[PDB]
Amino acid sequence: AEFKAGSAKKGATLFKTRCLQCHTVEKGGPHKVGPNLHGIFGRHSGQAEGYSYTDANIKKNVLWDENNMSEYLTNPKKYIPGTKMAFGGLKKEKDRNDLITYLKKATE
Ligand code: HEC
């Protein structure tokens, strides 16, 4: 289960079609249904300012690096049981690689 760099342009389209409805990426962006994801890489789960998380997300206690992010997005409910993120996952590894490649650039 390992991250390789991919197309940033493809993961931008995957983000907008699958994530943007619940999330934002810019600094000082609004919390919508899910939390703003700025500075997500390097931070642990459940740690964005002013967002009310489920205990499941906090208690998971994992660093959001590229591999843990990729495992989470394969199937969120399996990785964090009781998470309120209503998302089934991205099954293809290529799509997760592309999304993370985009999301690392967008969220810093
Ligand atoms: C709602 C319809 C969502 C969609 C679609 C996606 N996400 Fe989400 N995400 C959502 C919520 C409500 C939460 C909070 C988790 C909880 O149960 O408390 C999340 C959480 C995440 C996280 C973890 C953030 C953290 O721990 O600080 C990540 C990394 C995340 N979401 C990413 C993400 C991606 C990449 C998506 C599409 C590809 C996506 N989410 C869709 C709500 C919703």
Give the residue, out of 41, 51, 85, 92, with the most ligand 1 atoms within 8 A of its beta carbon, to mutate for a pocket test. Answer: 85
| CA gap 42, 39 in Å, rounded | 7
Output the six-digit token pair for 19. 């994530």
Please say whether the beta carbons of 48 and 71 come within 8 A. Answer: no
Distance (angstroms) between ligand 1 centre and the Cα of 85 equals 5
This structure's resolution (Å) is: 2.5
DSSP the chain: -------HHHHHHHHHHHTTTT---STTPPP-SSPP-TT-TTSBTT-STT----HHHHHH--B--HHHHHHHHH-HHHHSTT----------HHHHHHHHHHHHHHH-
